[model samples]
Target: VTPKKYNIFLASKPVDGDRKWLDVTNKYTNDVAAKVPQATHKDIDDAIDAAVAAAPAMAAMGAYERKAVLEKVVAELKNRFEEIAQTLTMESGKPIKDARGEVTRTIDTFQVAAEESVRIYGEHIPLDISARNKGLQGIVKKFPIGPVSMVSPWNFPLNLVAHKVAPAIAVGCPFVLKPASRTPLSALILGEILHKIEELPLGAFSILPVSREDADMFTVDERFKLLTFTGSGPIGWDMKARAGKKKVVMELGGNAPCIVDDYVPDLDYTIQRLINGGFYQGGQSCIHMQRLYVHERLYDEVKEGFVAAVKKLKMGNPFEEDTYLGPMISESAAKGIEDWVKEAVAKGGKLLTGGNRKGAFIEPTVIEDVPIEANARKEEIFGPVVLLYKYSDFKEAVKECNNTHYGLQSGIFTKDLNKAFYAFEHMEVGGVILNDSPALRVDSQPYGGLKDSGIQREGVKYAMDDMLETKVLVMRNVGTL
Candidate 1:
């Protein structure tokens, strides 16, 4: 179990600063979760003031110093891997093994940031094309955009926060973060680690578990040059509209699809990965495989194997060794998934296997013949459920994949190069996985979606791009000197 209380880390240089605290409630149970700092408008102003004041120093620091700080964070995370994992498991209701993996991914994300800190590069331009540019030299350099505001989601708390926080620090963008209320502990824990670092710039980081009512401070304040958020689609887009003057980057979840062709090279391997993709972390991921469209030739065999594999998945206690499915982030989330499944079944969808719920835990569920308009088919079923479909034509499969309003990522298992190319050309998603599930992600790869899914990319280097500004320097008649 997590400690009864944890002070929200404000990332003050002394590692000991005056702070007011508030109690955090557990996601699964109604018990007192932990104590986090309550953020007032004054605290928000102080955080903005602190980060704004420190921006120049943070930007002025040599890249090596930033690299060292990020490297130190990686080492600390590694040293306390189990501690971070346990806390993540307790607060987010993720299985301990999965929590361990997330902590490892957190280290990986920071490691990428550590290495990338020294790799920021810009291009030089020969400005001699025009007579006005004769004997003039131009060079472009990237500078930190100054203070940033980040709002993180609870689904993948540690690593997701790292995706924003680590890169902002690496690129010298001092930032204020608001961790999701349901999973604030990990971010605060990370904040505590940063506070202990001697090399960390004053006000380089502050994590506040504030109410959504006060979130306007993060968006409306002109001091914060950029706002990055990750969560549901409705909220992300709304924030983008209200994020006045600041650049906004959002990663809203989507209803991702995975298409299987008759030319499958390894059917069994494909089935196993699909099982992992659809149900990993109880399917709360943005790109969780909600729709599986298989070629008619392979439908029966694929469906039988996939259902059998899903049925064998153990559900319940996150702390158990064999339990594959844990509780949803909250009871409401579980209820929503249940209601969607029920609605789809009522609409003539065949409930092939598993549609039961207890508390925050929903069984790994699968359904077929779901109506096209069902929320389960057209929307993000951010739960352990998969909708199966059969297609006779490859072109039709790609059409179905693009039929939804959301376009994030997609997967197709095929040995046919032509069919893969066709899907690649027609699919509307930001990225397409060949012979794999839509859940596949590498921390360093470009990783946002298209359409209503999101506005910009979020890999370390890409996110760093948004956190900085490109400035051009010109020297006139330098050659004449």
Candidate 2:
């Protein structure tokens, strides 16, 4: 077995400051790793300028050329997917199995990009001569929007970064990306793989490790044609305000919830979904089920079933391939979650089960009597803790489930079409699941949230839309030439 190399933060790439880094010792390893440097502010600015400078050439490249570049990027990643998964497990605190899932998602995302590069097509408009006043034949083609600025969070570094960079390349747009500092190493290497592709043009792609302040500067700069981000609600809104004339797309944080009505045939399925929705990745996803609502008729049975299942989840070092729940991103994340749970319990909320932390790992928790007014329920809890409330009426259960500042995703376990359609029609969240877990997605479907969750959509087709700009070209003639 190859021994793991310890890492320290170093300043290989220049930015604004010295690009200082801390000793990020692993949760499994007792020793510190070698230093991995971050890009400085100067480096970030230079990268942005380079991307902006290279846009015309990128736009000039034909579909086949772009296809070749993206294909190589996809191939390089395909060969190294497992190693990348291990990296995610180490840095992002995701279990190895879930880390593998994340890499699969990223790989699939890039495959979609590769396919899109070859499929960029134009549309023609039909109009009558009388309507045109003169004779004209009109055709329109989409075009790249110069350089793009992408900012991603630490939650799912590979997939989030892929969401931004893949589209930019798929539609022939040059881009500069700044992944979250905590999870830079994996993306940094991925950037290198793209950079080293034979004959990959300059400024076509670049990764900068910059501060949020620097990210703001880019978003506000006139040269940045697009501001694509994945982060929290306040920051997403702030970016929209700051993006000025540029197009902006955001996937903000959310306190996604799940509702369990009494009409379903299998209570076991609902219990299983509880694990999939809330505890996957230790609950760091925007679509994670933070709140649980069950009908009173099935409340005791569901609660007992969920707690019993939770007891079976094995939590330990993420490097262990069989582990389910693992540590969160940081020690402070654990502390913060614990403090919030404490406050909720103090405020007359009942602590049903699981509210303890050790180092960076927090016990998977399910709290009942968690009033919607409680900050813990309303707030975006990105840890493996879930809050539940019991309701007597199905409509009321759906209402209580939908009641929140976030609207990313919600789940339901109902066989009644009326109940499913009602929840689907009125739920404030973006996507609702009926008879299944809400924590599911296909690579091609439109994925995003509503209200405070985010703006714009992300999927293969939607990303293709975001990456290219609509342009119309017409040939006007009086002689009907």
TM-score, each model? 0.96, 0.91
Residues 41-97, candidate 1, lDDT per residue (tens digit)?
Answer: 777788889999889889989999999999989999988989899889878888888
Point out where model 1 deviates above 4 Å. Answer: 1-3, 11-21, 25-30, 130-132, 262-265
Residue range with the least summed lDDT across 10 consecutive positions in model 2: 7-16
Alpha carbon deviation, residue 36, candidate 2 (Å): 2.6
RMSD (Cα, Å) for all candidates, in order, is 1.8, 3.3
Candidate 1 displacement at residue 226 in angstroms: 0.1
| Angstrom error at residue 131, model 2 | 4.0
- Alpha-carbon lDDT of model 2: 0.77
lDDT of 1: 0.87
Q: What is candidate 2's TM-score against the reference?
A: 0.91
